[PDB]
């Protein structure tokens, strides 16, 4: 069901795969982050261990805050691909 | 699901891998830094051991303060890669 | 996840390795310096042993004071490498 | 849909590409500038580091103030191109 | 989207690259200058080390004061290039 | 982004390199000059060692006083190069 | 019941084996730790035997406190393996 490489069943299958992979990724990351939160403790506000450890958790927080826009762009990519497929069909189907 | 090398499932898997690796790294470093903090003691403010040891902990603190911006740049890299993928799709899909 | 040799997982692993190595180095040096401080005594201010020993501890202090800037430069190196990777991606990804 | 090289679908696609590229550029620059602002601190008004660092941020501000007119001219270019296309159609279509 | 070599997407990409490179340069220089400021001390106003070191920091200050106008000219260059592109389009598009 | 050899990204990268090299040079020279100042002592105003050593430190002072204008000219060179690039663009871009 | 090496009966059997092994391990360690607690006595807070013995029990406590996170990671591993199996099925079953 297509012209050269645009196959609607293939597109649906690809959407399937990306959705399940993203769900798995979120699940695994949440499960592991729970363990991370359990592992690290809060020694004291101003002792040696605080100086030793605080920037690490800061970087953790920063990167995990960077994830959302990555996901958003990953989402927008598919609309572009589908649109290109539609245009390619239209171009030479007439 | 792509044109030449841009595969959304591959991108999601890569995001998975980088996230888990970063979580592991933070966990290991925090756990080890706790042991470091436990090991080293505070001899005295002005004795020989203080002169012998203080610059080392100073360098420790400095490097661990350098980590955050490294993490931030590592995060920003992915947005660039995704953007390049989108542009590459757009360029020749029409 | 990259173009030629820039791999974000590899970068994260390298950051892991350098961090743990630096922590180990600081730990070992502090532990050994404690033993050094315990071993050497203070004979007298002006006797033969003082003349014999003082420049050695002076050199010790000097070198250990030189360490911090070495660590600082070692830290700054990674920002340069990450930046070069980003630029290399940008150059030919479009 | 044209005469020699003026194709309205091609023009629309080009407008698409330039718009998305400009949006990406603004997004990336804002995200990176946030990191720059976070990284650099304010040492003191008159110490060595101030003398060492102030002209750099001055140049940053200047260049980022130069960007707007560049964008404006980039925008005006398209009107010229479309106008030339219209005139070229008119010249020999009658 | 152009006539011979003037491509608005290419121009936007080039603006992207120059902006990110300039941001990186400012970031790296500020970070390194902080380390320089930390490293060098102030011995005394009139001793040997002062005579030995003062002209070096003077040259540092001078060069870093020279940077701003370099950045300004680098900025003005792009307006010229865009203007030349516009004129080149106008010349033979009619 | 240029015509023959004038590339604004290349110019920015070159400015990066020269800045970092100059910072390193100043840092190394200051650090070494501190050691020089520590090493040499002041024997007496009129003894043999004074006659033996004074002209050497005089030459040191002279050369280090010559450095600043060298740095100034090195700085002015870049303005000339950028100006030549601008003129070269203007000459044949129209 | 699978495609290449992913067999749900095999997975269930493996879960069986790991569960029983973990139960046995906990049982044996608890039983032995009871004997350890019975064997060692508390001589006095400050005598020779206290200095001789306290760090040993400290290390015991530390290691047994390290066990929990080991178990947690061992648990999380299976979710990853099952997820990889699901993805592998999905990839080429369509």
String of DSSP letters for G53-66? HHHHHHHHHHHHHH
Q: With H, G, I as helix, E, B as strand and everything else as coil, classify residue B5.
A: coil
Whether A38 and G72 lie within 8 Å, measured CB to CB: yes
Cα–Cα distance between A43 and B52 in angstroms, integer? 26
* Chain E residues touching chain C at CB-CB below 8 Å: 13, 16-17, 20-21, 24, 27-28, 31-32, 35, 38-39
Closest CA to D28 of A63, F16, A70: A70
* HSE toward the beta carbon, residue F93, CA cutoff 13 A: 23
Whether E28 and C69 lie within 8 Å, measured CB to CB: no
Which among D36, D52, D77 has the least Cβ separation from residue E8? Answer: D77
CA distance D3 to chain B (A): 20
Q: Tokens 């369509």, residue?
A: G94
Residues 6+ apart with CB under 8 A from D56: E26, E29, E30, E33, E64, E67
Cα–Cα distance between E92 and D84 in angstroms, integer? 9
Cα–Cα distance between D9 and C83 in angstroms, integer? 39
Neighbours of chain E (3+ CB pairs under 8 A): C, D, F
Please provide the distance, in angstroms rounded to a whole number, between the alpha carbons at the two ends of chain C.
Answer: 16
Closest CA to E40 of D47, D41, C59, C80: D47
> Residues of A56-81 as b/e, b for ≥16 C-beta within 10 angstroms?
bbebbebbeebbeebeebbeebeebb
Task: Taking the CA atoms of A34, A38, A40 and A42 in sequence, report the sign of the dihedral they define.
Answer: positive
Whether E53 and F33 lie within 8 Å, measured CB to CB: yes
Conformational region of residue D47, where left means phi above 0, alpha means psi within -120 to 50, and beta covers everything else: beta
Are the C-beta atoms of residues A86 and B67 closer than 8 Å to each other? no
Closest CA to D48 of E70, E54, F24: E54
CA distance B48 to chain D (A): 32
Method: cryo-EM
Residues of F in contact with E77 (CB under 8 A): 8, 82, 85-86, 89
Take residue G79 and report the two structure tokens written for it: 């979710």
Are the C-beta atoms of residues B89 and B3 closer than 8 Å to each other? yes
Which among A21, A24, A39 has the least Cβ separation from residue G69? Answer: A39
Which among C72, C79, C87 has the least Cβ separation from residue E21? Answer: C87
* HSE toward the beta carbon, residue E1, CA cutoff 13 A: 27
Between chain E and chain G, are at least 3 CB pairs below 8 A?
A: no
Are the C-beta atoms of residues C72 and C59 closer than 8 Å to each other? no
How many other C-beta atoms can be found within 10 angstroms of the C-beta atom of residue C27? 17
Cα–Cα distance between F29 and F34 in angstroms, integer? 9
Residue E45: phi, psi to the nearest 5?
Answer: -85, 80
Chain breaks in chain E (C to N over 2.5 A) after: none
Take residue F93 and report the two structure tokens written for it: 């871009």
Closest CA to B11 of C2, D41, F68: C2
Are the C-beta atoms of residues E59 and D47 closer than 8 Å to each other? no
Closest CA to A13 of C30, C79, G91: G91
Residues of A in contact with G83 (CB under 8 A): 24, 28
CA distance D20 to chain B (A): 8
Whether C89 and B80 lie within 8 Å, measured CB to CB: yes
Whether D62 and E70 lie within 8 Å, measured CB to CB: no
Angle at alpha carbon of residue E33, lines to E27 and E35, rounded to 5°: 110
Are the C-beta atoms of residues F37 and E43 closer than 8 Å to each other? yes
Cα–Cα distance between B65 and E17 in angstroms, integer? 28
Whether E25 and F19 lie within 8 Å, measured CB to CB: yes
How far is the CA of B14 from the CAs of B79, B87, C90, D65, in angstroms?
13, 19, 19, 37
Please count the residues of chain E: 94
Task: Taking the CA atoms of G44, G48, G51 and G54 in sequence, report the sign of the dihedral they define.
Answer: negative
Are the C-beta atoms of residues B93 and A4 closer than 8 Å to each other? no
Take residue G81 and report the two structure tokens written for it: 């393996």
Instruction: Enter the resolution in angstroms.
Output: 4.8
* Chain B residues touching chain A at CB-CB below 8 Å: 1, 8-9, 11-13, 15-16, 19-20, 22-23, 26-27, 29-31, 33-34, 36-37, 40, 57, 60-61, 64-65, 67-68, 70-72, 74-76, 78-79, 82-83, 85-86, 89-90, 93-94
Whether D59 and E79 lie within 8 Å, measured CB to CB: no
E strands along B1-94, which residues?
none
Cα–Cα distance between D16 and C53 in angstroms, integer? 77
CA distance E48 to chain C (A): 20
Take residue A2 and report the two structure tokens written for it: 């297509």
Closest CA to B33 of A48, F48, D66, F83: A48
Which among C40, C72, C94 has the least Cβ separation from residue B87? Answer: C94
How many other C-beta atoms can be found within 10 angstroms of the C-beta atom of residue B71? 24
Please give the residue of chain G at the shortest CA–CA distance from A12: G94
């Amino acid at each position: 069901f297509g012209t050269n490489g645009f196959d609607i069943p293939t597109i649906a299958i690809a959407l399937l795969i990306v959705g399940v992979i993203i769900g798995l990724s979120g699940l695994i990351l949440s499960i592991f982050a729970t363990a991370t939160a359990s592992a690290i403790s809060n020694p004291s506000p101003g002792t040696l261990a605080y100086n030793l450890t605080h920037p690490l958790i800061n970087g953790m927080v920063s990167f995990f805050s960077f994830f959302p826009t990555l996901y958003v762009l990953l989402g927008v990519t598919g609309i572009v691909l589908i649109a290109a497929g539609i245009i390619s069909i239209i171009m030479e189907k007439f």
